[PDB]
Amino acid sequence: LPDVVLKPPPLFPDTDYKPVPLKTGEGEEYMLALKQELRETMKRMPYFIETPEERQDIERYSKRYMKVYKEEWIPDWRRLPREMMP
Amino acid sequence: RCPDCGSTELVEDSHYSQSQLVCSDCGCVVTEGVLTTTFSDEGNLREVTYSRSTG
Amino acid sequence: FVLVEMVDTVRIPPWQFERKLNDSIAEELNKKLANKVVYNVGLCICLFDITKLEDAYVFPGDGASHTKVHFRCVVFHPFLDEILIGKIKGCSPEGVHVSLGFFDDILIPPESLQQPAKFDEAEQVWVWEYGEEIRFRVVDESFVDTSPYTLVGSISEPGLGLLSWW
Amino acid sequence: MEVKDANSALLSNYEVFQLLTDLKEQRKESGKNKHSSGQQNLNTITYETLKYISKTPCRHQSPEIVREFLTALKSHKLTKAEKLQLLNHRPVTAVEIQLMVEESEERLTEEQIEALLHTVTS
Amino acid sequence: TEGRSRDGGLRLGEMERDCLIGYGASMLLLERLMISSDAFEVDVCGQCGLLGYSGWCHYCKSSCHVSSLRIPYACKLLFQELQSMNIIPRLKLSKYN
Amino acid sequence: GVSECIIMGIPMNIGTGLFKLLHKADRDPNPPKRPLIFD
Amino acid sequence: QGRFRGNLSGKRVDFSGRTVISPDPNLRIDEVAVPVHVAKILTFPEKVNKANINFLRKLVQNGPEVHPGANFIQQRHTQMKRFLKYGNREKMAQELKYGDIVERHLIDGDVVLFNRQPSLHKLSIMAHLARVKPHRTFRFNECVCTPYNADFDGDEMNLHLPQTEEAKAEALVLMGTKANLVTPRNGEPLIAAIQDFLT
Amino acid sequence: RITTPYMTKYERARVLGTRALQIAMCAPVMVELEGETDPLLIAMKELKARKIPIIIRRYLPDGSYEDWGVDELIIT
Amino acid sequence: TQAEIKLCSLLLQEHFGEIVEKIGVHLIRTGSQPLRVIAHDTGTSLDQVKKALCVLVQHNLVSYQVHKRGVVEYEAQCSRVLRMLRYPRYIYTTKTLYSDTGELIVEELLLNGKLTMSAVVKKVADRLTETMEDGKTMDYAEVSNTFVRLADTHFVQRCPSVPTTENSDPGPPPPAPTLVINEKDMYLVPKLSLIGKGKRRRSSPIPDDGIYWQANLDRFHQHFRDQAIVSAVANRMDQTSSEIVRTMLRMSEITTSSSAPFTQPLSSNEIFRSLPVGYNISKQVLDQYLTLLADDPLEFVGKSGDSGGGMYVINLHKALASLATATLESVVQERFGSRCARIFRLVLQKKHIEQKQVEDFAMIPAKEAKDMLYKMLSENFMSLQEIPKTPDHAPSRTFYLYTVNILSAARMLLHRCYKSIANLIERRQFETKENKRLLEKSQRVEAIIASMQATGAEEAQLQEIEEMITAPERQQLETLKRNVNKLDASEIQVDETIFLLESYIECTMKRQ
Ligand SMILES: [Mg+2]
Ligand SMILES: [Zn+2]
Ligand SMILES: [Zn+2]
């Protein structure tokens, strides 16, 4: 007769095997730094569609002093169908 | 017991085919309605004994 | 504070039919959202105005009136930068307990950023000196009905100078 | 139950005080025992917040007063949050806008503070 | 229950409901077959479409879309029985207006 | 359908359940609005 | 015996009755005689309002042992039911407030559904104004037997009592006997004279 | 306004029922009742007096509606 | 593909935005769809749909097709969406193969999808200008040389070309240009005569129009397969043998299609001359190496003929299957254990086997091996045949033969890797979001330095950078960072594993 379970199995059963330590070297750190810098570069690039800011109420002159500016790229419309023009 | 007056004089009396508990002091009902098995169901369900249940 | 565009259906019992509909709507709405925080919205206070008041339906059930109403009411919900001036009603060692004047004793500043003499040693110490103001950090809401709170926010007091009181 | 805008439009504490006084006088003019007995919470919040506001210098303002204050501050190109907080606190002492209030760097200009306090007194 | 030997009330046979429909007494029919036979109160989360309790939704782990609804107890029993068979009934509520 | 309406315990559309009632109360839709000064 | 064919298509209800049928020509064709014993059992929950406060007070004063009385009282605020067999009913009547629920006995003028077990056309079930009588059987005017197809040969006659003002008015207006003189099949009047009246 | 100008029996039944339910909840009365304790008697008294503050909202199948006051409708 | 869709949604939300990822997910889930139904079903405006479609097709993540009545139906490329995860590895392998100029070339191609000669050389020169100082200038000459070298190595290929609308159907324009791909100009680099220098961002007509160039990730995957194969060979037999395999694969890089069961026939005589002079070897030693690699049970290489001395061929499909089996045995060993790995390899060698045979051959007693068999069966790695003695195939009256299939286990393991990467991205994004307050705090403390960094930057504020309350909070930040770092690196490592399994899944599939 299997014993009746008085308290359910834990949300996490502890594991006997541990994860292997990751790779070490100049290549891995270069990988990581490259990926992290890529994160910001793709954030800054115009291909990153910024979400529309909202829930701002009233007007002021200070709006003109905290303006964030960035250039806007354009696609090649001869490769793109004409239907998708803004 | 009576929730308001605290009187423990709760008596069981049969109404027009309704089982309920009413306090004789304040005539306030503390528990009404009862659930009983019907013959159509008692004939289908099967009774179980302690021995066969425990194995 | 801030106005919120609030939309709700209000049920008016028939025994108030003699009164004007708008006034009964306002009274019921005031009774209905008083001292009651709204999840991800803030602490509602009182009704401001009633914008839209459409037809009053009657249902085959209760038999009273139901009117869908668009309106505006004021709530408390800082914008993570607002300056507050509250009173210290208690101070736990892990964090002081400030209360806005007669408003709510639910804003808990964890004492972690004032001048580097930070310790509340449980004999009710306001501050370690070299009617208390507040810069509000964040807001948070939760559903308390986890069993058949919810607006606290973190509060920070940096080196504002505070020449009036050290 | 749905809310369209949690930040539709910020309002000054003067409008809050005005609406609260109007609600108080109407409610005492519309004294009903049943509805008040059902929910005291509206009475408590109204009375407590009204007392809290009246303790502050939030009284003795008018729509003309606050509108002229806003127009005067508009030339000063200050952020609306800080000017609202000023009208919420009435800073007559220079130190509050100097240190207590934010955006002190590059914005006080060490000459606009006097006019700021003058407008506050108004 | 069944009858006099079991202190049971009368039975609205299908024909009686047919006559009631023919008259068009919608509210009378609803009251007779729901209020006077088996009335129950249920909570439905508009997001999940699933039943809830005490104005709470376990499946959605929330209470921001609950609502009250009167129901026949037999209907709720049928819903739960169908749930047991993994045929989950998702109720899509609509405003009365 | 009526069958499920009885099953679902909701009023049927046929008969008295067709039209909606409206309580003729003294009301002023779109009442005058208290203007905000700060905005 | 399953759910679908057993309890979903049709189901049993309470607040009903079944009694032997018997004629009574001294009643209007929209009226039905109800035995007192059934009247003392069937109760209609009346909401205590400004119009009928004194009426409900008197009915409560009568008690359950007298016919124009009540069996239960439900308070507006708390949902405790007060059974009128015990406790001074005069204090209880003086304790009445508007919005309370009083389960008064079936009294004169209450709209009551009246039906026969074999149902063929819609006139098999109607609504009548109930008048209480000291005898034991359901009585009504015989000019109404033709829609019911009853013949006073020991037949049993089902009685239903609505518990809602909306339902009560629906029964009175739609299935009122005066409103269903003609069958919908061909507009021929079903309620008319019968044997010993034509003669 | 193209539907029937007569006030059908279903409309009468539902209006009378809702009015009786309302007055049963201590709703205001406009027909100065003289000792009529039954709500429905007061309801049809109101209907005869044509002083019922209820507006029928007839619905066409498409969704379009039209509103008729009880006084505007012709009772039989 | 539910895990694939989830991971693709996470990646698209991370890299491009929200309205774009909604449309991408809808296309992935629905396949080919016209634009109007896309806008209607997604609940989005027409203009936002246009924006998402253009930013997607510019990077060649989605395409369009023409159908009856000239309708334009858009389709998504879920594999292409997963491909952006391997961008850092592509950058690393380009940086190793060639100078950082080619690294920036491929990086800009990935971040721009397709670029012309002028655009790519201008961008690369500009980005190379800031990497240096002292007034030196980059010229378009070296950038052009590196780009043409990359294209000739087939790492960069031309976009499908816009067909000549004047030559075919002059008149009513089709709704879409209907681009076509031409094999012979995928590497035909046009000349840019003009040479100049990129601006160093002081902040104070087109000779190459119609031709666009994109990273040829097929070349990257072929080179990565080469690297994996030579790494395995070096691990097993000898470094020199792996060098020989790498040399012959390099010989066959351009001569063989990306999808080939076998490589070209290569003889040891030309292998000797093609070998770098650094490896001091003799002809007979080369012959012995090649013969023993042909005798290697891993059967990476094969003779396929005795002409031209020792002529040899490599087994692409066999080598990929061997690599997949090695990865499978490694992961099952790491998660279950050494003895369960022994059982797995034993059943790998013996395709059909009974349970007691496994016990006897692996020398594992009862109640221990059988639990491993039951577990590794329940994890869908293992299959049972249920050979019956009758044809009712029913109760205790049939034999059960253990049989493990490489393909199914590889497929499910690929799904598991997808879900694992989804979990890692979810955890990193959740930890980033819950600490965005400290993120903005650190951003502000570094902005105090960066903004007004040389103009009026007093030293008397350098000591005020730590004055902000992040002094203990940086601790948390550091932990977050390393955790973030760890997660990213771990995810990248797992990505390589996917390239293994998918490669097998790609090579085992012919798509007739
Ligand atoms: Mg008979
Ligand atoms: Zn009591
Ligand atoms: Zn839910």
CA angle I378, I384, I387 (to 5 degrees): 155
Give G95's contacts (C-beta < 8 A, 6+ positions apart).
Answer: none
Q: Is E60 assigned to a binding site?
A: yes
Q: For the purposes of burial, counting CB atoms within 10 Å of the CB of H61, is it exposed (0-12), middle (13-18) or buried (19 or more)?
A: exposed
Beta-sheet pairing, I383-384 with C96-100:
unpaired
Structure tokens at C48: 């401001």
G49 CA from centroid of ligand 2 (Å): 25
3-state secondary structure of H76: coil
| Distance in angstroms (rounded) separating the CA atoms of residues I294 and I303 | 7
| Distance in angstroms (rounded) separating the CA atoms of residues I239 and I314 | 17
Structure tokens at C110: 């964890």
Structure tokens at E58: 């376990």
I168: part of which helix (H) or strand (E)?
A: none
DSSP track, I304-329: ---SSSSEEEEBHHHHHHHHHHHHHH
Q: For the purposes of burial, counting CB atoms within 10 Å of the CB of H16, is it exposed (0-12), middle (13-18) or buried (19 or more)?
A: buried
For residues A62 and D78, is the Cβ–Cβ distance under 8 A?
Answer: yes
For residues I470 and I442, is the Cβ–Cβ distance under 8 A?
Answer: yes
G84 with B27: Cβ contact below 8 A: yes
Greatest CA separation for chain H: 46
| Distance in angstroms (rounded) separating the CA atoms of residues G107 and G129 | 10
Nominal resolution (angstroms): 3.9
Tell whether E64 is within 8 A of chain C (Cβ): yes
Give C46's contacts (C-beta < 8 A, 6+ positions apart).
Answer: C30, C34, C73, C74, D19, D20, D23, D42, D45, D46
DSSP track, I44-99: --HHHHHHHHHHHHHTTSEEEEEEGGGEEEEEE-HHHHHHGGGHHHHHHHHHHHS-
Which backbone phi and psi does E50 adopt, to 5 degrees? -110, 160
Three-class secondary structure assignment of H1-17: CCCCCECCHHHHHHHHH
Distance from CA of G80 to the nearest CA of B (A): 7
DSSP state for residue I461 in the 8-state scheme? G
State the distance between the two ends of chain G, measured CA to CA, in whole angstroms. 50
The residue type of I237 is M
| Distance in angstroms (rounded) separating the CA atoms of residues H37 and D29 | 35
Which backbone phi and psi does I72 adopt, to 5 degrees? -100, 115
Task: Report chain B's C-alpha Rg in angstroms.
Answer: 18
| Distance in angstroms (rounded) separating the CA atoms of residues E82 and E93 | 19
Structure tokens at I134: 């002292």
Distance from CA of A19 to the nearest CA of I (A): 9
The Cβ-side half-sphere exposure at C39, using a 13 Å CA radius, reads 10
Tell whether I467 is within 8 A of chain C (Cβ): yes
Residue identified by tokens 């379970």 is: A5
Instruction: State the chains in contact with F (3 or more Cβ–Cβ pairs under 8 Å).
Output: A, C, D, E, H
Measured N-to-C along each axis, helices I470-507 and I316-336 cross at an angle, to the nearest 10 degrees, of: 140
For residues I253 and I230, is the Cβ–Cβ distance under 8 A?
Answer: no
For residues C45 and F5, is the Cβ–Cβ distance under 8 A?
Answer: no
The CA-atom distances, in angstroms, between I130 and each of A35, A73, I201 are 19, 22, 8
The CA-atom distances, in angstroms, between I243 and each of C60, H16, I153, I280, I481 are 87, 99, 20, 12, 39
DSSP track, I441-452: HHHHHHHHHHTT
The CA-atom distances, in angstroms, between I150 and each of E27, I116, I156, I196 are 81, 14, 6, 21
To the nearest 10°, report the CA torsion of E19, E20, E24, E25: 160
To the nearest 10°, report the CA torsion of D53, D56, D59, D63: -80
Q: Is G116 assigned to a binding site?
A: yes
Residue identified by tokens 């149902």 is: G119
CB atoms within 10 A of CB I297: 6
| Distance in angstroms (rounded) separating the CA atoms of residues I512 and I508 | 12
β-strand partners of C2: C75, D10
Dihedral sign (CA I349, I354, I355, I356): negative
| Distance in angstroms (rounded) separating the CA atoms of residues I162 and A77 | 11
I205: part of which helix (H) or strand (E)?
A: none
For residues G18 and G114, is the Cβ–Cβ distance under 8 A?
Answer: no
Residue identified by tokens 């505070």 is: C162
Closest to I309 (Cα-Cα) out of I286, I292, I277:
I286
Structure tokens at D67: 């509108």
G54 CA from centroid of ligand 2 (Å): 25
3-state secondary structure of C150: coil
CB atoms within 10 A of CB I243: 19
| Distance in angstroms (rounded) separating the CA atoms of residues G69 and G40 | 8
Chain E residues touching residue C60 (CB < 8 angstroms)? 26-27, 30
Nearest bound ligand to the CA of residue B7: 2
G149 CA from centroid of ligand 1 (Å): 8
DSSP track, I240-272: HHHHHHHHHHHHTTTTS-SS-SB---EEHHHHH
To the nearest 10°, report the CA torsion of I223, I225, I231, I232: -160
Structure tokens at H72: 């505007």
| Distance in angstroms (rounded) separating the CA atoms of residues D5 and D8 | 5
| Distance in angstroms (rounded) separating the CA atoms of residues G109 and G131 | 7
3-state secondary structure of E82: helix
Nearest bound ligand to the CA of residue E44: 3
Q: For the purposes of burial, counting CB atoms within 10 Å of the CB of A65, is it exposed (0-12), middle (13-18) or buried (19 or more)?
A: exposed
The residue type of I71 is V
The CA-atom distances, in angstroms, between I72 and each of G144, I136, I168 are 74, 50, 19
Task: Report chain A's C-alpha Rg in angstroms.
Answer: 27
Dihedral sign (CA G23, G24, G29, G30): negative
| Distance in angstroms (rounded) separating the CA atoms of residues I119 and H19 | 79
Distance from CA of C29 to the nearest CA of G (A): 21
Task: Report chain D's C-alpha Rg in angstroms.
Answer: 18
DSSP state for residue D99 in the 8-state scheme? I
Nearest bound ligand to the CA of residue G154: 1
The CA-atom distances, in angstroms, between I295 and each of E84, I290, I301, I317 are 61, 9, 9, 18
Give I286's contacts (C-beta < 8 A, 6+ positions apart).
Answer: I244, I268, I271, I272, I275, I310
Give I221's contacts (C-beta < 8 A, 6+ positions apart).
Answer: I258, I499, I503
- What was the structure determination method? cryo-EM
Closest to I176 (Cα-Cα) out of I187, I160, I192, I200:
I160
Number of structural domains in chain H: 1
At least 3 CB pairs under 8 A between chains E and A: no
DSSP state for residue C135 in the 8-state scheme? E
Q: Is G196 assigned to a binding site?
A: no
Give I197's contacts (C-beta < 8 A, 6+ positions apart).
Answer: I125, I129, I137, I138, I139
In the CATH hierarchy, which fold is given to the domain comprising C2-76? Dna Ligase; domain 1 (3.30.1490)
I350: part of which helix (H) or strand (E)?
A: none
Give D45's contacts (C-beta < 8 A, 6+ positions apart).
Answer: C34, C35, C45, C46
Which backbone phi and psi does B44 adopt, to 5 degrees? -90, -50
Closest to C69 (Cα-Cα) out of I335, E97, G186:
E97
For residues F22 and E31, is the Cβ–Cβ distance under 8 A?
Answer: no
Give D18's contacts (C-beta < 8 A, 6+ positions apart).
Answer: none
Structure tokens at C150: 């919810």
3-state secondary structure of I509: coil
D to F CB pairs, distance under 8 Å = 21
Q: Which residue of F has its CA nearest to C57?
A: F22
Measured N-to-C along each axis, helices I140-152 and I117-131 cross at an angle, to the nearest 10 degrees, of: 120
Distance from CA of D75 to the nearest CA of C (A): 22
Q: Is E45 assigned to a binding site?
A: yes
Structure tokens at D31: 């004294």
The Cβ-side half-sphere exposure at D18, using a 13 Å CA radius, reads 15
Structure tokens at F37: 């000064």
CB atoms within 10 A of CB I200: 14
Best of D79, D82, D107, D109 to disrupt the A interface (most A CBs within 10 Å) is D79
Length of chain B, in residues:
55
Beta-sheet pairing, B29-32 with B19-23:
antiparallel
For residues C71 and C50, is the Cβ–Cβ distance under 8 A?
Answer: yes
| Distance in angstroms (rounded) separating the CA atoms of residues I8 and I82 | 6
DSSP state for residue C104 in the 8-state scheme? B
Q: Within its chain, how far is the Cα of I165 from the centroid?
A: 36
E91 CA from centroid of ligand 3 (Å): 10
Order of strands across the sheet that contains E51-52: E51-52, E39-44, E68-72
CA angle G28, G30, G35 (to 5 degrees): 80
For residues G95 and G75, is the Cβ–Cβ distance under 8 A?
Answer: no
Ranges assigned E (strand) in G134-183: 138-140, 156-160
The Cβ-side half-sphere exposure at H40, using a 13 Å CA radius, reads 19
For residues G145 and G191, is the Cβ–Cβ distance under 8 A?
Answer: no
For residues C60 and G166, is the Cβ–Cβ distance under 8 A?
Answer: yes
Measured N-to-C along each axis, helices H39-49 and G165-174 cross at an angle, to the nearest 10 degrees, of: 60
| Distance in angstroms (rounded) separating the CA atoms of residues I49 and I42 | 9
β-strand partners of G31: G129
| Distance in angstroms (rounded) separating the CA atoms of residues I324 and I505 | 10
Instruction: State the chains in contact with A (3 or more Cβ–Cβ pairs under 8 Å).
Output: D, F, I
3-state secondary structure of C162: coil
G168: part of which helix (H) or strand (E)?
A: helix G165-174
Three-class secondary structure assignment of chain A: CCCCCCCCCCCCCCCCCCCCCCCCCHHHHHHHHHHHHHHHHHHHCCCCCCCCCCCCCCCCHHHHCCCCCCCCCCCCCCCCCHHHCC
Give I507's contacts (C-beta < 8 A, 6+ positions apart).
Answer: I259, I316, I317, I320
Alpha helices (H) in chain E, listed in sequence order: 14-23, 26-30, 73-84
Structure tokens at H32: 């100065």
Best of E56, E66, E67, E70 to disrupt the C interface (most C CBs within 10 Å) is E56
Helix and strand element counts for chain G (H, E): 6, 11
| Distance in angstroms (rounded) separating the CA atoms of residues I168 and I163 | 8
Instruction: State the chains in contact with G (3 or more Cβ–Cβ pairs under 8 Å).
Output: B, C, E, H
| Distance in angstroms (rounded) separating the CA atoms of residues I301 and I289 | 11
CB atoms within 10 A of CB A12: 6
For residues G44 and G110, is the Cβ–Cβ distance under 8 A?
Answer: yes
Q: Is E19 assigned to a binding site?
A: no
G5 CA from centroid of ligand 1 (Å): 29
Q: Is E90 assigned to a binding site?
A: no
DSSP state for residue D98 in the 8-state scheme? I
Q: Is E6 assigned to a binding site?
A: no
Closest to C58 (Cα-Cα) out of I215, H54, E42:
H54
| Distance in angstroms (rounded) separating the CA atoms of residues I98 and I90 | 12
At least 3 CB pairs under 8 A between chains B and D: no
F4 CA from centroid of ligand 3 (Å): 23
| Distance in angstroms (rounded) separating the CA atoms of residues G4 and D37 | 49
Give C161's contacts (C-beta < 8 A, 6+ positions apart).
Answer: D95, D99, D100
Three-class secondary structure assignment of chain F: CHHHHHHHCCCCCCHHHCCEEEECCCCCCCCCCCCCCCC
β-strand partners of C71: C6, C50
The Cβ-side half-sphere exposure at H68, using a 13 Å CA radius, reads 23
For residues C46 and D42, is the Cβ–Cβ distance under 8 A?
Answer: yes
Q: For the purposes of burial, counting CB atoms within 10 Å of the CB of E41, is it exposed (0-12), middle (13-18) or buried (19 or more)?
A: exposed
| Distance in angstroms (rounded) separating the CA atoms of residues A77 and I58 | 10
Chain E residues touching residue B38 (CB < 8 angstroms)? 1-2, 6
Q: Give the residue numbers spanning the domain of H34.
A: 1-76
For residues C26 and C8, is the Cβ–Cβ distance under 8 A?
Answer: no
G118 CA from centroid of ligand 1 (Å): 10
Structure tokens at I182: 């031409």
At least 3 CB pairs under 8 A between chains G and D: no
| Distance in angstroms (rounded) separating the CA atoms of residues I314 and I295 | 13
E21 CA from centroid of ligand 1 (Å): 26
Closest to E77 (Cα-Cα) out of E45, E48, E40:
E40
For residues B26 and B18, is the Cβ–Cβ distance under 8 A?
Answer: no
Q: Within its chain, how far is the Cα of G45 from the centroid?
A: 12
Closest to D86 (Cα-Cα) out of D111, D50, D61:
D61
Closest to I497 (Cα-Cα) out of I336, I380, I348, I323:
I323
Structure tokens at C153: 């926010």
Nearest bound ligand to the CA of residue G150: 1
Q: Which residue of D has its CA nearest to C160?
A: D100
Instruction: State the chains in contact with E (3 or more Cβ–Cβ pairs under 8 Å).
Output: B, C, F, G, H
| Distance in angstroms (rounded) separating the CA atoms of residues I462 and I465 | 6
Nearest bound ligand to the CA of residue B4: 2
Beta-sheet pairing, G138-140 with G16-23:
parallel
Best of F13, F14, F22 to disrupt the H interface (most H CBs within 10 Å) is F22
Closest to D119 (Cα-Cα) out of D71, D82, D77, D57:
D71
The CA-atom distances, in angstroms, between B41 and each of B19, B36, B38, B46, B53 are 21, 10, 5, 10, 21
Length of chain C, in residues:
166
